[PDB]
Design a protein around this nucleic acid. Structure first.
Ligand SMILES: [Zn+2]
Ligand SMILES: [Zn+2]
Lengths: 74, 74
DNA sequence: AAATAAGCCACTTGTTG
DNA sequence: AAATAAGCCACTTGTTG
């Protein structure tokens, strides 16, 4: 699945994790953006710094990202 | 929708809320079964005694019933 | 409206007496 | 296996600076 493709490219160093996502939600103290080789952001996925999982990101809602155990601790 | 049909029959007194669901989960101290006029249980739906909402019940998982605010307080 | 997320269910995997 | 539910996402409605 498309989830594992993204995670494989982070482990190889093809994708880098972006210092920060511009917003006001507490989730961004834990979750980060993913960058391709050309410095273009990977659309639709974010990275948890705590568990190192790749989670689906949709701008229409931040509830899945919110209730993810690593964010719910904040 | 089928959710509102069940709730309408509880408000009319056509459906009665059953004293208890046999199980070990804390959710059953708040959630109850629904009975038809002939005393046969309404399959697929449960009733919250606290908020009085009709929630979907599937025997394959109790997670939706679990994280419902009235149960999550226990 | 850009952003955030309550609050229901779907769904697969995992657990446990 | 009967029962319970972690733990991800879908999805519609509602909120708020
Ligand atoms: Zn995490
Ligand atoms: Zn309730």
């Amino acid at each position: 699945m498309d989830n594992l493709e993204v995670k494989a490219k982070i482990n190889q160093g093809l994708y880098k994790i972006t210092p920060r996502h511009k917003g006001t939600s507490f989730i961004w103290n834990v979750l980060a953006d993913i960058q391709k080789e050309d410095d273009t952001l990977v659309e639709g996925w974010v990275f948890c710094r705590k568990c190192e999982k790749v989670l689906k990101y949709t701008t229409r809602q931040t509830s899945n990202l919110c209730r993810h155990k690593c964010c719910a601790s904040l």
